[PDB]
Design a protein around this ligand. Structure first.
Ligand SMILES: Cn1nc(C(C)(C)C)cc1NC(=O)Nc1ccc(Cl)cc1
Ligand SMILES: CCCCCCCCO[C@@H]1O[C@H](CO)[C@@H](O)[C@H](O)[C@H]1O
Length: 332
């Protein structure tokens, strides 16, 4: 074990290896640090009360398992994870180390003037990262501009901050469908993409109902084919209950957009999530011709997430998390 030191920042104590220097608050509780081992600047996150409830303990464990697993350019990965605790008995705090990236995409959006080439490169990187995420059988479910770190050269990493967020949510997530396929995230890529083109939010709903009213205005009310898949009572029984809305043709909404951008949007923003384009399929769309490389759009190693079914005690989830701290191997 290295030697640690204690420092107080914004009413939060922080005990970190001497390696991590220059500490200064950024945000949960995140600091910028200077990593003297690799000469680069990092974000260090100290987890708040990680083993306080069962649910906190399980989420702490999912955090670590998940970040230990993500190893892709366009997805947040773990540079390091440490605890000041010398033993399990004494184990209480968890710090995560990741790359700091300057902005999130939210900053970059409303003040900069995005070329079609900007939208290609930014959207290409989200899909690329999503292929990877989705190949591990992970659905993000809350993809938005705040959850995309962008550096100065417009390199992009997907992440989860986590806890308006509703502006990018798939219609099915917002009616609480419970059977979600991965294309929920494709819906989110559509909303983001449209906003990078127009510079404005596609569905800036004021609340839940308004959000959905705005979605249907664009995509139209459900067709016969989609309707025939709805199991439920009055889930379907309020059919045209917000008028029998005709679907907008997107060439009319995205005037002066690359017609290939328009065509991809039509394939992302389908009501019926069985008809949505996949991440891997969207990669092969002519819109990404300048960036698409078939041999450098990698998939994930098998991700064991049996643990999610498990109902364990606070102290089992704490031990499991301890094991994960102990077993961490740093990137090259
Ligand atoms: C829970 N979670 N899920 C994902 C995805 C889906 C992108 C793999 C990523 C994460 N977790 C995070 O993104 N966590 C995280 C950790 C530290 C900082 Cl400074 C910022 C964010
Ligand atoms: C506003 C009316 C709600 C329309 C949302 C329906 C689109 C969601 O997609 C639907 O739901 C499931 C995915 O969760 C799929 O398995 C279904 O087959 C699919 O059609």
């Amino acid at each position: 074990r290295p030697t640690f030191y204690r420092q107080e920042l914004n009413k939060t104590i922080w005990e970190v290896p001497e390696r991590y220097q220059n500490l200064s608050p950024v945000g949960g509780s995140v600091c910028a640090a200077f990593d003297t081992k690799t000469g680069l600047r990092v974000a260090v996150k100290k987890l708040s009360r990680p083993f306080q409830s069962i649910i906190h303990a399980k989420r702490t464990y999912r955090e670590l398992r998940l970040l230990k697993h993500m190893k892709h350019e366009n997805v947040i990965g773990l540079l390091d994870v440490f605890t000041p605790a010398r033993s399990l008995e004494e184990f209480n705090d968890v710090y995560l180390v990741t790359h700091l990236m300057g902005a999130d995409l939210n900053n970059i959006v409303k003040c900069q003037k995005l070329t079609d080439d900007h939208v290609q490169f930014l959207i290409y990187q989200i899909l690329r990262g999503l292929k990877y995420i989705h190949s591990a059988d992970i659905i993000h479910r809350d993809l938005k501009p705040s959850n995309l770190a962008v550096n100065e050269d417009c390199e992009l990493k997907i992440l989860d901050r986590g806890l308006a967020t509703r502006w990018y949510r798939a219609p099915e997530i917002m009616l609480n469908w419970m059977h979600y396929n991965q294309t929920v995230d494709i819906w989110s890529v559509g909303c983001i993409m449209a906003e990078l083109l127009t510079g404005r939010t596609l569905f800036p709903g004021t609340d839940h109902i308004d959000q959905l009213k705005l979605i249907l205005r664009l995509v139209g009310t459900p067709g016969a084919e989609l309707l025939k898949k709805i199991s439920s009572e009055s889930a379907r029984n309020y059919i045209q209950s917000l008028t029998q809305m005709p679907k907008m043709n997107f060439a009319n909404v995205f005037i002066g957009a690359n017609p290939l951008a328009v065509d991809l949007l039509e394939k992302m923003l389908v009501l019926d999530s069985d008809k949505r384009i996949t991440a891997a399929q969207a990669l092969a769309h002519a819109y990404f011709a300048q960036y698409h490389d078939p041999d450098d759009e990698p998939v994930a190693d098998p991700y064991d997430q049996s643990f999610e079914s498990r109902d364990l005690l606070i102290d089992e989830w704490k031990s499991l998390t301890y094991d994960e701290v102990i077993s961490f191997v740093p990137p090259p």
